[PDB]
Structure 1
Amino acid sequence: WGNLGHETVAYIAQSFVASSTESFCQNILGDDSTSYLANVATWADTYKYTDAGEFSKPYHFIDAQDNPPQSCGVDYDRDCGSAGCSISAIQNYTNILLESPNGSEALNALKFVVHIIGDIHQPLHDENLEAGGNGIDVTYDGETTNLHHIWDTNMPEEAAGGYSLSVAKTYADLLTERIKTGTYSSKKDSWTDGIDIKDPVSTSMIWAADANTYVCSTVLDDGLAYINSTDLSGEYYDKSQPVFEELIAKAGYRLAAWLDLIASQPS
């Protein structure tokens, strides 16, 4: 996602974490504001453009070698690759926070987990084709862009009504309502099925496989004749909106559950 999506995921997670988890994270981050997670949710996307952070570019995605829209699937050993991936990064940084939460690596580990659980839920961050859709040029509201970009940025910002941290907070409030009582309230009690702090790869692969299903059902189902030729800000946006909104909600809910397990200690 772009910055709005990551901040929204982070604000949702803040609304679901336990108090002890909030304290654990505020202490690592040195921030006890009501934006503590949202304030770091974009860091990984700045870091990756620096020499020191170049290593971490592959950690934003897992290039699933499926065949969409005909067939979708993610396989860790087939798709992660030698340079690592979102799944291998969740394992590494989760294990740093479990083993060394008071050490110097904890700060970046937590900022990576906040960001990357967001990225796992962007379907085109779970797809090899055309570098996650970066190579598919499209038109969106009269502008030339690419399919990856409209899922990261154009469509979420249209739905949220802007791009800023305050707009993200409002959007997160809307999606948090949908989880607690609204649209998602009868399905969210299944969203953490299979979660296992002792198996970060298995857990994050469930999430990535869930998001990847939408590459076939939603991202690419219209077929590339349509996608290449049609302004996607109309009916394509209309069908995409419920899907990316539910995936942003899932990302925040699952991030909170994961942070609770990372911070958890038996009383």
Structure 2
Amino acid sequence: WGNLGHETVAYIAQSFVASSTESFCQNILGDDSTSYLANVATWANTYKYTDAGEFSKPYHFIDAQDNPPQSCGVDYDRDCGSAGCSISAIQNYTNILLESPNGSEALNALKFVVHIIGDIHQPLHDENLEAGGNGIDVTYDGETTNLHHIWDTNMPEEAAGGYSLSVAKTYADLLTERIKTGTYSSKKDSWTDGIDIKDPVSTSMIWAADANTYVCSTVLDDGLAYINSTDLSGEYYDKSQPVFEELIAKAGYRLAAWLDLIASQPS
């Protein structure tokens, strides 16, 4: 996701974590504002463009070698690669937070988890084709961009009605209400099925597989000729919106569940 998506995911998580989980995170982050998760939700992106953080670029995605839009699937051994991926990074950073929650590595590990649980839920972060759709040129409301970018940024910003942190907070609260009492309330019990703090690979693979199904159903089902030749702010947007909204909601809810687990380990 772009900044709006990541900040939305983070504000949703802040709405669902336990009070002790909140304190646990605020201490690690050295940020006790009411935007504590949202303030750091883009850090991993910032960091990957620095000298020290270049190595972490591959941690934002898993390049699933599947066959969309006819068939989708993610396979950890097949797809992660020797440079690491979203799934191997969730393992590494979760385990840092379990083994050394007070240590010097906990700050970055937490910021990585917050960002990467978000990124896993963006379907094109679970797809090899043309570098997660970066290589696919599109027109969006008259602007030339690419397919990955519209999923990350153009479409969520359009749906949220902006890009600022305060817009993110309002979008988060909309989606949060959908979870508590609205259209997602009968789905959310299934959203933490299979979650296991002792098996970050399996757990994050559930989420990656889930987002990946949308590559076939939604992202690419019109086919590449349609996508090359049509302005995607029309019908493509209209059918994309409910999918990215639900996936952002899931990302937030799952991030909160995972943070609760990490924060509750005895010591």
TM-score normalized by the length of structure 2: 0.99
**C-alpha deviation, 1:161, in angstroms:** 0.4
Q: Is the 8 A contact 2:98 2:265 kept in 1?
A: no
Give the Cα separation in 2 of the matches to 1:24 and 1:51: 29
Give the Cα separation in 2 of the matches to 1:67 and 1:225: 16
Give the Cα separation in 2 of the matches to 1:264 and 1:173: 25
Give the Cα separation in 1 of the matches to 2:48 and 2:204: 21
**C-alpha deviation, 1:7, in angstroms:** 0.2
The equivalences for 1:64-83 within 5 A come to: 64-83=64-83
1:195 maps to 2:195: yes
Give the Cα separation in 2 of the matches to 1:184 and 1:232: 26
Structure 1: state its 5+ residue gaps.
none
The equivalences for 1:13-162 within 5 A come to: 13-162=13-162
Give the Cα separation in 1 of the matches to 2:50 and 2:32: 28
SS in 2 for 1:4: helix
What do the CA deviations read for 1:10-57 (whole angstroms, capped 9, x no partner)? 000000001110010010011111100000000001111111110000
Q: CA RMSD in A?
A: 0.9
**C-alpha deviation, 1:265, in angstroms:** 4.0
Give the Cα separation in 2 of the matches to 1:265 and 1:43: 25
SS in 1 for 2:222: coil
Give the Cα separation in 1 of the matches to 2:25 and 2:35: 12
Q: Is the 8 A contact 2:80 2:87 kept in 1?
A: yes
SS in 2 for 1:191: helix
What is the number of equivalent residue pairs in this alignment?
267
SS in 2 for 1:139: strand
**C-alpha deviation, 1:96, in angstroms:** 0.3
SS in 1 for 2:139: strand
SS in 1 for 2:162: coil
Q: Structure 1: which 4+ aligned runs deviate by more than 3 Å? A: none
What do the CA deviations read for 1:96-152 (whole angstroms, capped 9, x no partner)? 000100000000000000000000000000000000000000000000000000000
**C-alpha deviation, 1:225, in angstroms:** 1.1
What do the CA deviations read for 1:39-92 (whole angstroms, capped 9, x no partner)? 000000111111111000000000000000000000000000000000000000
SS in 2 for 1:178: helix
**C-alpha deviation, 1:266, in angstroms:** 6.2
What do the CA deviations read for 1:181-236 (whole angstroms, capped 9, x no partner)? 00100011100000000000000000000000000000000111111100000000
TM-score normalized by the length of structure 1: 0.99
Give the Cα separation in 2 of the matches to 1:51 and 1:58: 15
Give the Cα separation in 2 of the matches to 1:181 and 1:190: 15
Give the Cα separation in 2 of the matches to 1:63 and 1:69: 15
